[PDB]
Amino acid sequence: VDYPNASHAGLVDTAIGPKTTIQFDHVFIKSDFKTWLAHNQDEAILLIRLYELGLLLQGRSNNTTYITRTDSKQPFLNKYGKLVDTTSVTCLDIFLSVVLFALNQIDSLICDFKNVNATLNAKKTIELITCGLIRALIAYANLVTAFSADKTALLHEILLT
Amino acid sequence: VDYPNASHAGLVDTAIGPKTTIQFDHVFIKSDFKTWLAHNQDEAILLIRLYELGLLLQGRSNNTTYITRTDSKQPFLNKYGKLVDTTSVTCLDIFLSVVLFALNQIDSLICDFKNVNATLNAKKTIELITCGLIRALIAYANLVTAFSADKTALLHEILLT
């Protein structure tokens, strides 16, 4: 536990670099936030899909190269690796705020919606939404708690530097 | 905006004390986390109800005075004010972690549950649960993002002290 590289070599978690750390003021720390992003790529991409939705609602909004189609997840796996490559706590703050703005919006929509076959397919719609919003919210609830945990570790390290 | 007390006095948000701030290492900051707790007492108490549930599952677990009944929210409004009176980021971390442990558990239960009148009332049960878990999760998603925001402000202030 204190000498983990010895442990493995007898009886990834020591790899240090941009995809496994965050920093504030060039004070780096091994990042739970990132480690969650590493074990939950599908859910990560889900929050990345919400990040895109959050920018459009606010009104904010290339280099595809191929003249033949390829994969529809291609774009979202590209962004996925730019997120993980990002160590700045200040940039990561932006990301999670935009994403939360989308979660609140989808929820405002559902709540609003709660207050023939069109209707039967319009109910089924909102029910898929609520299903996704659950998953994203537990993904968000878990991701940012880890991000919050990381900061309590950067708060400690700064005071000791 | 820069002189808000003048503004109000012509054309609560400057009150400084334990219920409106958090600190790390006696470095205080005006707290979004707290301000959310101030505008969402019902939802706050909901997360406090989950805090209690989170301790029991882990196995962790008085002074009621009255020999006549009173109110069933009495206990949870007492804890509500101990939370708001708490400025330590390190204590607040505990609280939100315990609460997240409960959210994950309720979700593990629902997922598990997805894989006569007893059954009809047992389905209705899990559906109320999912309804609450939504509300708590958006309450949690919003509360901790604000807590995370607070830390980005404590990270800044420390480096300037």
Numbering used by the authors:
A (entry chain A), B (entry chain A): 14 to 24, 33 to 82, 90 to 143, 192 to 237
Anything the authors wrote about it?
During initial analysis of individual crystals of recombinantly expressed polyhedrin, we noted the presence of a crystal population (approximately 10% of crystals which could be indexed) where the unit cell had increased by 3.5 Å in two directions, giving cell dimensions of a = b = 57.2 Å, c = 105.8 Å. These crystals diffracted weakly, yielding a dataset to approximately 2.8 Å. Analysis of the structure showed significant portions of the structure were disordered. Residues 143–191 could not be resolved in the electron density maps, with helix-α9 and the N-terminal region of helix-α10 disordered. The region between helix-α5 and helix-α7 was remodelled and helix-α6 was poorly resolved. At the N-terminus, only helix-α2 remained well resolved while the connecting loops and helix-α1 were not visible. The crystallographic disordering of these polyhedrin residues creates channels within the protein crystals. This increase in unit cell and the disordering of residues appears similar to that observed in a CPV4 polyhedra structure where similar changes occurred. Whether this crystal form represents an assembly or disassembly intermediate, or an artefact of purification is unclear.
